[PDB]
Design a protein around this ligand. Structure first.
Ligand SMILES: Cc1ncc(C[n+]2csc(CCOP(=O)(O)OP(=O)(O)O)c2C)c(N)n1
Ligand SMILES: Cc1ncc(C[n+]2csc(CCOP(=O)(O)OP(=O)(O)O)c2C)c(N)n1
Ligand SMILES: [Ca+2]
Ligand SMILES: [Ca+2]
Lengths: 813, 813
């Protein structure tokens, strides 16, 4: 569970010292100066004579606008951390403000501790300034390469769901979440404000949202800066906050005076947080109004007010570079030089180029430093889950009654296994669900915990399995669920979420950002220790969207995830739970894994169980397997066709086609694929099947009928250099279906058992089996018309039980 | 331009008549009866003796919970439309309340007009009940197959961006937008409330958001129903609404009394809307507080209160079916029978099984009916745009200086063309951007229009090109931009939006829903006429994300769009603008198209122009072409290698590699691909290249080096059955890059000009070209060291001009 760090939720009980605040102003001055140097300066970081256009970067890249306001907040937050001993992680929503977070880490000393070549002297500063957004150097954003970051803020919107995930089961943590006012325009951010109804102030930490109301985005004003101030406070109050508002920088108020006003507001806010935390030790059943700060300052604060007659400070024009180039003209260079001198760096750095002791005496120390706090590198907190014995959850009936036994709903087995994970690991594992945890059948967890709910309660007739603290959280928002789990992982904990397959797409771009975080981490950030994997049960899938139809039919998250499988990063798993025992084999592997996104595609509908647990774990190891017990062919050379499947429903249809083919005396081999990436080119992926193993499973030269859960294009793109790839006939989802029967869903996508029997026969010998093909094609129409006449499927389809099941016996019928 | 329909914004000036209200209660009762019949009954719709379990559907599919609340609001909306002659489209947020939208259309008489077999008598009604969510019947949701729908509501979240897009430039239209309280938990819905700062009450219509606060989602209460009522009102007021609340159904109040209170509230709300509209004719520069309605009623309203001892009315338990089976026991069947009787259908239908005249005398007639209004079938409003002459925008320099001339920023040309489309079609065409309109270089439109902004103004030094009415809209939300445009198309108008390439994935699931909407329509909804296409400029793309790095590098919308290319639907366009002339060629074609989603991938960075407009149109017709002026091989059999490209940057790299291969004496053919689906299997796609045309462009047997803009997996899966596909060496984006130089971006993805020259030589004869290959690989290293050392790219990379340009002539370089 999360460490208790420092002395949490302690009041100052004294005014902030004049000396601490002179410190904060020096910090702000040197952070701004560092921030400008990074964007503008390729050499001569301290402007030693002569300081010339020659010292300016050729391509100016970086964002000034947000930066001075981030520097101001971070200096004040550092002062606060130090005075109070407060366990603090920031979330920099405007992550394009990267130079604010690298400057922080440089100033707190974690930069040089982590990057020993970047030294606390003039030569380290020259390197520091040059490498920023520079080839061979470091990103423009508050990237994973920077100590103190758990949130890059490149794709906007996710600041609040990450802040709130972070504080979950983390009662000593405080998260100042800085939210851009443009970012507050996004849908994910807008809903993220409401997270305060889903945390508990005794058993979780505290989020202080800070709206960075600097009044502009790239080329527009922001909605929230331009509505009435009274509508702005009502909005936040309506969302369960106590809004406080600070305005500064719009007139000639001297900076010390601003710091004094701000530190005093900050302490009042903090007193209120401390009251909330103390009350919560006694009463954590009535939701408080949590403070939030409206921080209203001019965008680009402290840069030149006007440049070439254009308003710059306090404008969208300051967004990127306020001085657009300083290499082109003498006069532009001069504006740059005067801007950098305005911070009076000769008072901030010693003759050696180190920042002075009196600039940083106010800073926190040790693990309370923003860049050093372990919650910002949660891999160092994460330990292996204590897992229950996998064998305890096995579907034992395959071993007793045969392959293909039963009508289990597979995800219930993951339900029972996860419940015992939670029991063994209280406070370290969460489930999230956009109002679908019971619908995906994970509700066995309610035997040991509850849905966490901190809005009103009204009656034991409707409020079941909810309590103000619990390890399951639901809100109808894929953004919140994904974001909450991401940050729970990044702070060193574990969990799973589930979603209807088609709506996983709502968060494709979040999956992309988390994959890229992981890709960068495993490639070049070895100090950022492995975090637990983001595990996503993809269920209520395409083939069985019973109550819903066409808009709910989209298994293409497979396609999106394939765009993050390069370079042997291994940060993606794509799995098809063939049945419940395969689902156990996949879950155990994913729950042990670290630094991945695992999509575990599994059916919640009644279905056959194909494999014993031992057989599933053996299959999963390579990722695909022949099923000798299912094949009529004695070896590869004798197979007339390969019947291959990935997905619980494709496997069902392939299995049923295999019984029909057996009846016709066909010789064939059955293959099952459970890990999509086992099929990937062996030269791109050093964990995939070797060309030799692949040819052994699929044959060097027989026709391969492959029934795929998602879009056929996935498999086609993947196997393009594999032996025998030209003999693959890949069937998959084809954008057909509606509100219908199970048979009809497979029929209209050409993947039903009958069509599969026909296809195999056409691939073997079309003229010879022409009458058999024609009669299967007619039966497809007879079975559809049966569904239309009757409202349920043909008994040939529903009553089929694989020939492998002992239907002579007890409870096998 | 939108039709002015009826007599808009008129007050009643009298109480609603007791008679109109008895009609509303009857509508409510018979719509409830029709909704239950659809969910539960396969025959005997009027419960004629004997009425038994045999009349009940074997599989109960559908959603009751939201439905009686929808039916109530719709009866009352129907009374209001009749009484006022008000041009009205509803948005059904809880689109799973399909039975209400179908019930509505059956009642207003549109269903029988559109579906003549579904008659208004017993036999028609039996068919109506049976077909609902049933194999061979109609969907579970308010699908495009329903008259009156322009919003399915399958994936929740979009009710409000659609409502607001629908009213833009549509000053007589009124949109009651019904939003689920669960749906309001989603990111996209939460930011949609803010659209009231982006519309104008004189030049646009009026949305009335109606929060369907029934207290539950699937398995949970809802946040907004369980916070204090005082917070609920502050929240809506802080977002610029005047909130009004109605509560009913929680006690024994009789129904007529509920209807009287509601009609009175509705008229008061309406009078405030009429005042807002009348004031707006005089003062439209001060934003009003727009009414919204909080409609708080028990979920499942009017179903049995308890079933089997469980609370059902006023519970999440009523979400799907409140009575889970009505075939299993006599007792359950009996509950269904009593629930059906409780509406007294013996008073609602005549002996013929037609709904009686007194039930519906209060209803609206003609084009004002919810099902008949042309805004709910915008294709009948849409006319072709008046396009300016394409040749006016041509980059003429190619014709004068040669292929490869210049350093134009291609999207500026589209910007100029779009400016004059707006000028020629004022009030009929819009540009949307998530704060990226000027960034993607579409700003020439500000010469004929302005960004629409209805929040505060402060100063002409920051407020440029903004006006309270205008044809460009920006908010930093891809869900808002896509949603506004969708509904602007669905109501018969035109436009375009632009996005950074990587952040298109934010709205992948909106693209999916809209593509499924177009798929169902082109397949089987001939009466829903063609709407203009959803055109998306995808720019600031992966190869040139200069200010930004790795989070901004993801061209994978291509891969998402390929999952919607089946069945010859032709609802997807995927285009690569090779240069500004191809961009013109693509745009013209997109702007003329209907019933599509067009992705237009185009570069905003400085780049060569390859083609004349005539050549670009010619290539685009077929989608791919050989470039004979660029080839050294005289015909195919003499080609040593084919150099193929898709995308402006791949084309640039290929062309520079081709100048290098010329110098080495190599004989090669150069191919360009502008339309990705030109490559699709000719069995799947009847507009694709036939295999002959394909083999003729790509050769039947020579090596094919293909530089692709996006992920290589796309192209490989597409061409899996094409002749010569095994000889394709496809390079594309590979999840590498950071904040770095143009050359470094292509190098690290193995698609730079030097690596491509090397791959070409490896493919022809690795041993003969060993030295040259080795020299090319050393130079990739040297060109990167030069970027690290200097901060900009090697003059060999930077200074290259295609040998096809006449550099002798004065203005060519
Ligand atoms: C989802 C998403 N869309 C678009 C962008 C492009 N973008 C980068 S910065 C920015 C403006 C951000 O403004 P704000 O949230 O106000 O930050 P600030 O004024 O502090 O720099 C935009 C639109 C993005 N980064 N993320
Ligand atoms: C984006 C999205 N996620 C999940 C679902 C699954 N879903 C369908 S209905 C529903 C509950 C919605 O409740 P609400 O908006 O309160 O509608 P109502 O109570 O009026 O039936 C959910 C979660 C969905 N349709 N869309
Ligand atoms: Ca801002
Ligand atoms: Ca609801």
């Amino acid at each position: 569970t999360s460490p208790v760090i420092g002395t949490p939720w302690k009041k100052l009980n004294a005014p902030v010292s004049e000396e601490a605040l002179e410190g904060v102003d020096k910090y702000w001055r040197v952070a701004n100066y560092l921030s400008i140097g990074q964007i503008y300066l390729r050499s001569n970081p301290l402007m030693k004579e002569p300081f010339t256009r020659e010292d300016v970067k050729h391509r100016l890249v970086g964002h000034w606008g947000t930066t001075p306001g981030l520097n101001f907040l971070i200096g004040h937050i550092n002062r606060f951390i130090a005075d109070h001993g407060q366990n603090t992680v920031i979330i920099m929503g405007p992550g394009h403000g990267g130079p604010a977070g690298t400057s922080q880490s440089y100033l707190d000393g974690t930069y040089t501790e982590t990057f020993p070549k970047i030294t606390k002297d003039e030569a380290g500063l020259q390197k520091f300034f040059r490498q920023f957004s520079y080839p061979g150097g470091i990103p423009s954003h508050f990237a994973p390469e920077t100590p103190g970051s758990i949130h890059e803020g490149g794709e906007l919107g996710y600041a609040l769901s990450h802040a709130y995930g972070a504080i979950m089961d983390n009662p000593s943590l405080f998260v100042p979440a800085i939210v851009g006012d443009g970012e507050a325009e996004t849908g994910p951010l807008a809903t993220g404000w409401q997270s305060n109804k889903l945390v508990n102030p005794r058993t979780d930490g505290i989020v202080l949202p800070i709206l960075h109301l600097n009044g502009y985005k790239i080329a527009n004003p922001t909605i929230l800066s331009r509505i009435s101030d009274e509508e702005l406070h009502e909005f936040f109050h309506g969302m369960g906050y106590e809004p406080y508002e600070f305005v500064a920088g719009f007139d000639d108020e001297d900076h010390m005076s601003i710091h004094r006003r701000f530190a005093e507001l900050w302490e009042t806010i903090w007193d209120e947080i401390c009251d909330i935390k103390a009350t919560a030790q006694t009463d954590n059943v009535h939701r408080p109004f949590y403070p939030m700060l409206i921080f209203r300052t001019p965008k680009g604060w402290t840069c030149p007010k006007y440049i070439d007659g254009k308003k710059t400070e306090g404008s969208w024009r300051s967004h990127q570079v306020p001085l657009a180039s300083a290499r082109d003209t003498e006069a532009h260079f001069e504006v740059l030089k005067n801007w950098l001198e305005s911070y009076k760096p000769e008072e901030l750095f010693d003759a050696n180029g180190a920042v002075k002791d009196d600039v940083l005496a106010f800073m926190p120390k040790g693990e309370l430093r923003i860049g050093a706090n372990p919650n910002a590198n949660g891999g160092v907190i994460r330990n292996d889950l204590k897992l229950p014995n996998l064998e305890d959850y096995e579907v034992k009936e395959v071993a007793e009654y045969g392959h293909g036994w039963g009508q289990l709903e597979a995800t219930r087995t993951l339900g029972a296994y996860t419940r015992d994970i939670i029991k063994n690991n209280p406070r370290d594992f969460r489930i999230f669900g956009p109002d679908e945890t019971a619908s995906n059948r994970l509700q066995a967890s309610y035997e040991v915990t509850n849905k966490q709910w901190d809005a009103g309660y009204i009656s034991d007739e409707v409020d079941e399995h909810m309590h103000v603290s619990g390890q399951v959280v639901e809100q109808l928002s894929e953004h919140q669920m994904e974001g909450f789990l991401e940050a729970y992982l990044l702070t060193g904990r574990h969990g799973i979420w589930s979603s209807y397959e088609s709506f996983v797409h709502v968060i494709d771009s979040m999956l992309n950002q988390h994959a890229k975080w992981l890709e960068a981490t495993v490639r070049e950030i070895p100090w950022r220790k492995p975090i637990a994997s983001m595990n996503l049960l993809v269920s209520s899938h395409v083939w069985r969207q019973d109550h819903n139809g066409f808009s709910h039919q989209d298994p293409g998250v497979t396609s999106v995830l394939l765009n993050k499988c390069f370079h042997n990063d291994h940060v993606i798993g794509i799995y098809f739970a063939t049945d419940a025992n395969m689902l156990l084999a996949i879950a155990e592997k994913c729950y042990k894994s670290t630094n991945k996104i695992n999509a575990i595609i599994a059916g919640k509908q009644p279905a056959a169980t194909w494999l014993t647990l031992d057989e599933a774990r053996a299959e999963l190891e390579k990722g695909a397997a022949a099923w000798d017990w299912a094949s009529t062919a004695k070896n590869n050379d004798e197979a007339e066709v390969v019947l291959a499947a990935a997905g619980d429903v494709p496997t069902q249809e392939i299995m049923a086609a295999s019984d029909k083919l057996k009846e016709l005396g066909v010789k064939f081999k059955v293959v099952n694929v459970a890990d999509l990436l086992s099929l990937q080119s062996a030269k791109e992926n050093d964990e995939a099947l070797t060309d030799e193993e692949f040819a052994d499973i699929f044959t060097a030269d027989k026709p391969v009928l492959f029934a795929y859960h998602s879009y056929a294009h996935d498999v086609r793109g993947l196997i393009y250099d594999r032996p025998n790839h030209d003999n693959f006939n890949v069937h998959g989802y084809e954008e057909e279906g509606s509100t219908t029967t199970p048979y009809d869903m497979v029929r209209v996508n050409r993947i039903d058992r009958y069509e599969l029997t026909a296809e195999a026969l056409r691939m073997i010998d079309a003229d010879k089996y022409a009458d058999k093909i024609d009669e299967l094609e007619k039966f497809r129409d007879e079975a559809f018309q049966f569904a239309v006449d009757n409202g349920y499927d043909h008994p040939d389809y529903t009553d089929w039980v694989y020939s492998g099941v002992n239907t002579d016996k007890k409870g096998a019928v």
